Structures are given as structure tokens and as C-alpha cells.
Amino acid sequence: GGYAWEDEIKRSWDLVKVMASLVASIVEARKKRTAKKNITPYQRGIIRSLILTLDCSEAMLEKDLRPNRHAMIIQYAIDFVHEFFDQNPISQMGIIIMRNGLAQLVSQVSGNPQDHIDALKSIRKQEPKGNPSLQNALEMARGLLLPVPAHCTREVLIVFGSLSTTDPGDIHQTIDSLVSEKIRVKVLGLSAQVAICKELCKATNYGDESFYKILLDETHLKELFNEAVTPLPVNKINKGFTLVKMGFPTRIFEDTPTFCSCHSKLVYGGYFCPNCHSKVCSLPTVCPCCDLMLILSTHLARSYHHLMPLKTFAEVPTTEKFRSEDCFSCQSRFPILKNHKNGKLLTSSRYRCEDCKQEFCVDCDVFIHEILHNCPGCESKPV
Amino acid sequence: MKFYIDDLPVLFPYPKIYPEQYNYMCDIKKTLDVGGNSILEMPSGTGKTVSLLSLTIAYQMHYPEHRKIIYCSRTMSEIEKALVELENLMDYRTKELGYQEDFRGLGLTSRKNLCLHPEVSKERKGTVVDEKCRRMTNGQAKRKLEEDPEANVELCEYHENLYNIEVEDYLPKGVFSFEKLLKYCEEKTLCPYFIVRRMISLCNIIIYSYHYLLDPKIAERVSNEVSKDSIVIFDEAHNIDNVCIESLSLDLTTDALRRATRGANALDERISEVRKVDSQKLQDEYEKLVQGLHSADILTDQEEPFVETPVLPQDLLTEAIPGNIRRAEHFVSFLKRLIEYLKTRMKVLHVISETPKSFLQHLKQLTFIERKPLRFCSERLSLLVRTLEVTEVEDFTALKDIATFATLISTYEEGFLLIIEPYEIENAAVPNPIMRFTCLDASIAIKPVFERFSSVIITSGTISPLDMYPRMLNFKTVLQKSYAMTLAKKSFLPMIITKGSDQVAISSRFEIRNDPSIVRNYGSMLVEFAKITPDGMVVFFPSYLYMESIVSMWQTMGILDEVWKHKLILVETPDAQETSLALETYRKACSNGRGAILLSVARGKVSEGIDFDHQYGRTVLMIGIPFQYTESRILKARLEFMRENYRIRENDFLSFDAMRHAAQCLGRVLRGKDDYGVMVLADRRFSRKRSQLPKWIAQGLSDADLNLSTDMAISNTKQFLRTMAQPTDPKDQEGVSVWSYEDLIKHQNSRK
Numbered sequence A: 001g002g003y004a005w006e007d008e009i010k011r012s013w014d015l016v017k018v019m020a021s022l023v024a025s026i027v028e029a030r031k032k033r034t035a036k037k038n039i040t041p042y043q044r045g046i047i048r049s050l051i052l053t054l055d056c057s058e059a060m061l062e063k064d065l066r067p068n069r070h071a072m073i074i075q076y077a078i079d080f081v082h083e084f085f086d087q088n089p090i091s092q093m094g095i096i097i098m099r100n101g102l103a104q105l106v107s108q109v110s111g112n113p114q115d116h117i118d119a120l121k122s123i124r125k126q127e128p129k130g131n132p133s134l135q136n137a138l139e140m141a142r143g144l145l146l147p148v149p150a151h152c153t154r155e156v157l158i159v160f161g162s163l164s165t166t167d168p169g170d171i172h173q174t175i176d177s178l179v180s181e182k183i184r185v186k187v188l189g190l191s192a193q194v195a196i197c198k199e200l201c202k203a204t205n206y207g208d209e210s211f212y213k214i215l216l217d218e219t220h221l222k223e224l225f226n227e228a229v230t231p232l233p234v235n236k237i238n239k240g241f242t243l244v245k246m247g248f249p250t251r252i253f254e255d256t257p258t259f260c261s262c263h264s265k266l267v268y269g270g271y272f273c274p275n276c277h278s279k280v281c282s283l284p285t286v287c288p289c290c291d292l293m294l295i296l297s298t299h300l301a302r303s304y305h306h307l308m309p310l311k312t313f314a315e316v317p318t319t320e321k322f323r324s325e326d327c328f329s330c331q332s333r334f335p336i337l338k339n340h341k342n343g344k345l346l347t348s349s350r351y352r353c354e355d356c357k358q359e360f361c362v363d364c365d366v367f368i369h370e371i372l373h374n375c376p377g378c379e380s381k382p383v
Numbered sequence B: 001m002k003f004y005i006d007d008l009p010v011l012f013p014y015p016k017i018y019p020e021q022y023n024y025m026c027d028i029k030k031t032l033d034v035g036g037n038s039i040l041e042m043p044s045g046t047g048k049t050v051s052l053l054s055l056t057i058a059y060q061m062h063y064p065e066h067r068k069i070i071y072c073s074r075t076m077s078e079i080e081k082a083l084v085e086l087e088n089l090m091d092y093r094t095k096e097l098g099y100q101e102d103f104r105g106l107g108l109t110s111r112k113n114l115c116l117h118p119e120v121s122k123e124r125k126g127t128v129v130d131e132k133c134r135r136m137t138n139g140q141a142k143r144k145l146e147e148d149p150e151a152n153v154e155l156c157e158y159h160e161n162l163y164n165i166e167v168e169d170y171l172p173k174g175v176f177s178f179e180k181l182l183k184y185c186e187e188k189t190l191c192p193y194f195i196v197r198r199m200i201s202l203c204n205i206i207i208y209s210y211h212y213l214l215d216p217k218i219a220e221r222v223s224n225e226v227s228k229d230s231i232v233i234f235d236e237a238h239n240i241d242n243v244c245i246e247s248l249s250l251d252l253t254t255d256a257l258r259r260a261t262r263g264a265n266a267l268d269e270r271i272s273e274v275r276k277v278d279s280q281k282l283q284d285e286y287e288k289l290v291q292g293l294h295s296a297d298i299l300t301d302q303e304e305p306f307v308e309t310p311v312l313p314q315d316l317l318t319e320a321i322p323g324n325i326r327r328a329e330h331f332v333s334f335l336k337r338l339i340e341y342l343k344t345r346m347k348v349l350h351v352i353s354e355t356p357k358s359f360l361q362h363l364k365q366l367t368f369i370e371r372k373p374l375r376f377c378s379e380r381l382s383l384l385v386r387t388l389e390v391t392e393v394e395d396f397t398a399l400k401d402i403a404t405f406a407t408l409i410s411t412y413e414e415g416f417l418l419i420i421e422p423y424e425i426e427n428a429a430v431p432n433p434i435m436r437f438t439c440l441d442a443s444i445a446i447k448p449v450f451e452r453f454s455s456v457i458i459t460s461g462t463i464s465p466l467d468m469y470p471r472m473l474n475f476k477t478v479l480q481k482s483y484a485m486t487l488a489k490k491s492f493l494p495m496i497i498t499k500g501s502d503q504v505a506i507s508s509r510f511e512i513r514n515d516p517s518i519v520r521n522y523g524s525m526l527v528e529f530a531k532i533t534p535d536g537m538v539v540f541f542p543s544y545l546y547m548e549s550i551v552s553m554w555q556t557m558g559i560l561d562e563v564w565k566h567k568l569i570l571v572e573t574p575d576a577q578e579t580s581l582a583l584e585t586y587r588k589a590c591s592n593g594r595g596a597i598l599l600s601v602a603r604g605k606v607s608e609g610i611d612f613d614h615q616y617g618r619t620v621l622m623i624g625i626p627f628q629y630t631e632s633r634i635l636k637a638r639l640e641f642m643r644e645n646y647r648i649r650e651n652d653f654l655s656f657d658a659m660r661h662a663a664q665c666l667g668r669v670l671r672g673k674d675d676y677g678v679m680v681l682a683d684r685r686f687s688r689k690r691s692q693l694p695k696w697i698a699q700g701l702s703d704a705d706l707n708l709s710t711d712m713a714i715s716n717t718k719q720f721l722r723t724m725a726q727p728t729d730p731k732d733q734e735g736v737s738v739w740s741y742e743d744l745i746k747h748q749n750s751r752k
């Protein structure tokens, strides 16, 4: 029954109270890869039309993300557009912000990464303000995804860091319209699980509640982006199984600059359309003479790898007799990595592949599974 | 699924089951096999209603006794919820067994909730609906129209179609929720009220309020149709003592006695008219009273007494009339001098607190009126009103009031008290004297329930302590146990805020309700919560004048203007129609993501029955402890009687009642283990009351949250809502928080 000062000293020096260190991390590694042991080829949305909905509000001025929410989201959206065009080039991208209660379309839907990056850096300067409304943004996305063809998937991403939406009309009618228009919605909120966003992700994505994601820290946000670049697997009842007419233009070479059909500007290079012999600036773009999706082999090449997902490399048991001392794809010596003499041999770093029975190290596994998309062991096998 | 507990095939209508649910079913089956009283708290969140319904239907169908099931709730909101869960369970049982078995289940409520008459449907009172529906269907109007077809009296077609169809063919077999029942009776042009009142003896389950079991004025007809050897379940049975109190309590004002004088004069005029015109009805009523025929001996089954019996049926006197009130004019003079005696009793300048024995002795020394003629007062008045066949009964309601008072204070002398007090509100400039006849012993209204029935289930989501209720009510349990609901991740985060952002201690005492620092701290925490709460709030305060003063002060100081930016603000209204409109407005604003805050009474209509599951409740802002008005003399009478008889300390019972209202408010936010929501408690005096809390609530309350200010509480809430927004691991919750059929079978094998 005394004051706080008249009790005792804090004893902070005594507060700190004080080879099997390998297993304490590697069992966590097994637990992390336990969620990824299931893999099968899912048919995914290959020709995509994404609408990136951006919150531009007073909630984006919150001092929880550095330096504000606004700058980090706009630069991560720049990064997202760059990496997504590097992984899904044949897609068509529209960018929209949600500012001052009206959904402001900052760039038309297009296959040009540079124009969208310019729009993002233009919005980077301005100050986020106003009360965000979801229903305006979903109605704008419904409008812009109307000219999207049946083969091209209608997809919308929202980064909604706010907690309340003030809509001019009923948002459930907009949800029903989007479900009726087969528009799949993934929402990336920043603060909490907003119930209308949860219902939107459940209804638009056929009862799936896994499309509403909330970050935990700085790195998990970039995790949300770089698994948001992936093509979403389509449902079995979706029948948009069509053939798409597109041609393969050839790179014209000329020392005389000529008017391109898209911009009416003098470009030395170009790609002559096989259907009508019209040159363009960039690929992959539609031909603005005969409406032909002009491409390269590289653009479909970037999308083959999703259709052939590599099965996860299964790490060999330490007890079984190892196949070789070095790795297969980089021939780094597999570390003996013996804990102690009594601690024996643990965490053998050899990752077997089930289709070829070839061992790989940890760096080889974490290189072959996202940067490469072939197994060199599966290819050295003379089939 | 379909599993076995001992020899009981249980058809659970879900593919999975909680472990707490199955241990609860084991305990309930043990109680039913043993027989007797039991008090069990099943935590909110986890399915409570459907689990009881499943075990009771399995027990009734499987066991050869086939005892009927009694299920007592507190509101027909919860009764309708139970009927809907029963509809789902019967649909599952029909699907699994392949056939619709012989089963009858209905809920029970008043005429006002069950009147399909297009003319008398817009009345704001249930009493006028009842008096009109009696007036046309006492059987007096039907025989009058039979004698005189050209009469202007009218009948309800919904009741008259019930005479055409057979009793057991009123409805098809199965469950009829109130929405489905009203839809069917709209299609078939039938009265649902009389159907439900005629299916009491036939329904395997009947669900009604505590009023339809405790208050004898409406439970007298209900209890005569139910089975004595029937399983009785008390759901949300934490304020049942309060209902027992108001079942045998009574109030009268001086306006009531003025209307009693006017009604007595009108009755004297009416009886003079009867004696002028035709005294034969008076004559044969007089000889029937000489014969000793009681009200039920002369009233038909299709008619009801004009004033209902306010006392227990076992406490009624079976002997004949004493004869002082046998004549109509003698009874009129008797009741008029009752009115004048009580009017004389109001002229006093201080509090009168006397026993019914002292009051009747003062009666017998001031007038010459005995207890025994007063014990037949309501019966005599109802018989006289029936025999007079008065067309209108609007002016005779205070006669019901005084007959109720006479019978109640005559039949009852122990466990009751009369409070006569001159200032019914202390803010009134003019004195307005009041009388309060209160029921000190709450065990009286529940005693015949324990006497009649054998197997009794007492259950609330938040009832604590478990042994508190066998003290206030004279009954012995066979087993009491409290379950700790298990979590893969902590779904609920309870807090205690003892100080504001400036570390100034916050309190909700009624004398310091106008403190600018405390109100400003409350406004600050609610603004910050509204900035951080995603979907929806319910906020509870102790009293209605407390919201009135405190929201007047924040609207003056501009807190509510800042709240209007984030969430739409909804306030509980004494008009329950406007309150329900505000409630559905709140639910709509939570559904579309508009965001809403609800300000409610912690002891009010919204606190009971209404559940804020999922988005409807995300943060439960508990501003202060909902203590009652201690200076109210009735509460001091409660405390004195509990201390004198049941040895319960005054502060103990005060704190217990206040936090049990707090706990019944807290239990409305969770439904299912996927549901999440915080229970923040903003008062400096919650910190010492963790040991009283519900055990599942108590295990969720950490030592670090016993005394927090605003800011770290806000950070804890922010981290918590970021945590529960993450998708949980199914492997983390595969067999420790929920069981499938295989997990349940494995645990049954492990137990064996």
C-alpha cells in the first residue's frame, strides 16, 4: 500500500534469463512447405482484363505504412504493373482510383505498361482525400469490362484500406450484376475484414472466401502483390471455350521512318500485321486496322509455364543413401551439415524430383520453382 | 451427422460438431436420465439452441416414455430463432430418416403478435386487441347473432373457420415458425392464436416466454394443458428472477384511482340500469354464488375472465363466497370503499414501507374489510362484468387494477411488501404519490414449476455464478458445471478500460454523469473505435437518462459530428417500433459496409434477445457498469430480503446483477467459432470483477488487460482485427476446436 517509487528497482539486468539449432529452423521450413505439398494443373484465366481499384482517401493518409499508405501503394502498384506485364503480357489493363466520392478512371484499359506507369506516377503527386465509395468503382469496372470479349477474363482488384463505404445506391445490386456478368473480384483490404468485401469476394468468386486478403506487415503486402500476379483458376461451370483469331507480325527493318498505324508518328521499327500489312509500335497490341491481336512467340511463351506447373521437389530422407555428393543443376557440394557426433545427420539438403529421381540443393529448388519452369533432371532423362 | 450417445441416436444437422457441444450433450443426457434440476452455461458462439433441440428430439423419439418437451425462452425473437433452428433440424431428420415423422411443434405468444384480423391490426396496444377479440369471441356475440341475424355485431372469419375444421387438422404435421404460421393462416384464413392455444396438449414441443410460465394471469390456462412429466428447458435463464419479481409485483398511481372512481360510478350506473331492466341475470348469478360455484364452474372454456387471476392457482381459495360481495351493489360499495381507502393511503409526505399483514390490519381497523372477501375480489369482479354483458370495457380497466391489488395483497403476506412513496419522480415539482406492491421472494413464482415438473434444464449463455441461482431460488440441482470453450486462435478479445487517453479514471456513477473529463474520454474512445471498427457496433450504457444526458453533451461538444463521418449513428428509442426500425437500419448499414454504431440500454429491449453476430457486432463498447438505481426503494427491499433470508450481501447482489446484465450484453456478439469480436469494458470498477465473470469469458481475459487506458487498448484491438482477418489454418482447427464424425468417434473411443 505505497507509491510506485517506494517499492523496488526494476531489476532489468536480471530480466534476461539464460547442436539442435538446425532443426529449430528446418522443422519450421517443413511446416512452411507442408502447405505447398499439394499441386495439380489448374486451368487458369490466361487472357486477362484486370481493373486495379485504388483507394485515394483520408484513410490513405494514415501513418501505419511508410511514409503514408498512399506512396507505398502507388509504388507497389507501379511494381505490380511492371511484374504483371512481365508475366502476363497479352492482358489488357485499366487503372482507376477512388477519390472524393467518385471513381476516377485514370487510364483506359490497354496493353501498354508505360502509359499505366505514367498514370500511376501522375497520381503519385496528388494528395489522397475524400470518402471512398465501392459501388462507384464496381460500376465503373462493370462499364469498362463490358467491351471485354468472352475469352478474356473479367477481373477486378481493389486495394480498400478504408473500413466504411458510402455508396449512392444499393451495392448488392451491383454485386448481383457483377456475378451475372461473370466478373471475378479479389479485394486487398489494408485494415480489417470488411463484410461487404467478404461477401463480394465470396459471391463473385463462386463461394470462395479465400480471395479477401489482409496484410500483416510490410513484406506480406508485396507477397499479396506477387501472388496476385498469378492467373486465377477458372471454375468448372465456366464455358468460354472459344478460339481466338490473332496473327504474328514480323519486325520490319527500315532506315526510313514511317507512320505507324496506331500513333501516326514516325517510328523506324515496327511490326507489319500479317492480316493487313500495318505497322505498330509495341507488342502485344491489337492491330488498329483490322482489330487483330498482334503478338510475338515470347508473349504466349511467358504464359506456357502456368499451364505446366512444376511439381514440388521432395527433399530426400536423411536416413536413405544419397545419390551423389554434389547437386545436379549447379553441382554445389551438398553440405555434410552434421549437427554433432551424437546429433547425427539431419536436414539433408538434396531435393529429389519425382519424375526424374534427380537431387537438387535448396538454391536449385528455389531457382527452378519460380525463375526456371523446367526440371533439368526431367530433361537429361532420354525419353 | 448421426452418432450415438449411450443408446441414443442423435441426428445432428451439421457435418461437424464442437467438442464442447458433445460434452454438453453428455451432461444433458446424464441429467435427463437421472432427473432433477441442473444449471449449465453453454458459451455463446457455439451452437446452443440447435444442440438442445437435437438432444430433446432424439430423447423423445427414441425413449419409450415419449415425454413431451417444454422450452421456455424470454422473447419471441429467441422463440422464432428456436423455431427456425427446429425447422432446419426437422428437415435434416426427415432427409436422413427418409420420412416426415409424427411431430408437432409451435411457438406461443400473445394475440397482438398472432392477430390476422384486418380491422383490429393497427392498434398499438395488445390489451385493446385482446378486449376486441374477446368481445366478438366470448361466445356472447355468436349466440346473439344466432338469435338475431340482423344484429350489427361482427365476428372474425379467421376464428370461425376453426370451428369448421377438426382440432388435430388445424395444421399439417411438423414445425411452423411464426412467419410460416402467419403465411399459412393467411392462405387458409385461420386464427393462429386459437390454433396455438388448442395445440398445447398436442405439440411435442411448445415454446413460450417466461411470462407464459411464471405470470399466472396467462400461464393459468397454459399449465393446465401441458404434461406434468415433461422435460423443461430454460434458455437465457439469467434474468428469470426479474420476471418472477414482475409476475407478482404491482403499481398504482392516483390517476389510476381517479379512473377507478369513474369506473366504479359507471358500474353503479350500469347495475342500476340492470336492476331497472332485468334482475334475472343478477338473481341466477346470486344463486350460483350461493351454491359455491366458482368462476371456472360458470365461465365457459371459450371465454376468459374479465380480469385474470394474478395469484398462483395452488394459492386460490376453494371455498365459496363470504357473501359480503355476493350482491352486485354490495360488491360495488365494497370496491368503492377499497378505492377510497387506498386514495386515503396515498395522502402521506414520506415513505411507507409496511408488510401486507400490517396493511390489512390498518385496513380492518380503518374500514371493516377482511382478507377473505378480498381473496375473491378479481373472481367476483370478472363474474359481475360477464353477467352484466357490458358492450365496452374501456372505463373498467382500473377495476381490473384494484381487483388485482386486492387479491394479490390479500392472498400473499410473506415475501411481499407495500411501498407508498410521495415523489414517484423526484424531479417533479408537484408531488405525485405512488404505491408499489412488490414481491420480495423471487422463488415463489418458480416454486410450482419445480413442484410440477421433474426434469428441469436451466441454461444461459452468460450465467454466473452457477450457485447464485439455487440461493435466490429454493431448488437443488443435480449437477452444475461451466465449460471452457477451446480455441485454435483466440476468437474474442475482452478488455477492461479503467482510464481515458489522459489516464484519468473513468466512472459511470449517476452523480458524475455530467463530468466533462469522463464524457470527453468516452467520446474520444468511441471516435477512435469508430475510426478502427470495420463493420458494426453495439454500445451499452446503464440507463436511458444516461444516454440522453451524455449524447446531448457530445452533440453539444461535436464528438457525434466526427462519428457521423465514419459510421451511421443509431440510438435505442422507447418506441419499440422505432427501435426495431433502427435495429434493421443498423443491420442494413452493417451489411452493405456503410458502418454503423448502435447506442442501447444495457438493461433494455435490444440487450435481450437480439444478437449481433458477425458483422453486426465487431466491437462491444461497454461504457460503465450497468448498475441499477440504488436509491430506488424497491432495490433496497430486494437487497434486504436477500440478506435476511438467503444471506446474500447487498453489494454482492448489486454487482452480480449489474455484471450479469453486462454479460448478457456481451454474449450477443458471437455466433459460431468463426465469429470474432472484442468485448471492451470502459469503467474503472470492472478491474476487480474478473472472478465473477463467465468462465469462458474469464479464460479469454488476460492479466495484462485488467487495467488499460484508451491507446494501448486501441492498439490491441487493431492487432486483433488484423489477426482474425487472416485465413486460419484448417490443420490448426481440424480436431481441437471442431470435430467431424471421425474425430467424435475417436474421442468416444478414447473416453471408453
Ligand code: SF4
Residues within 6 Å of the ligand: B111, B114, B115, B116, B117, B120, B133, B137, B156, B158, B159, B190, B191, B192, B193, B194
Ligand atoms: S380471432 Fe384471431 S385473427 Fe381474429 S382478432 Fe382474434 S387473434 Fe386476431
Ligand SMILES: [Zn+2]
Residues within 6 Å of the ligand: A260, A261, A262, A263, A264, A265, A267, A280, A281
Ligand atoms: Zn504508334
Ligand SMILES: [Zn+2]
Residues within 6 Å of the ligand: A273, A274, A275, A276, A277, A278, A287, A288, A289, A290, A291, A292
Ligand atoms: Zn491488321
Ligand SMILES: [Zn+2]
Residues within 6 Å of the ligand: A327, A328, A329, A330, A331, A332, A360, A361, A362, A363, A364
Ligand atoms: Zn544445386
Ligand SMILES: [Zn+2]
Residues within 6 Å of the ligand: A353, A354, A355, A356, A357, A358, A375, A376, A377, A378, A379
Ligand atoms: Zn525432374
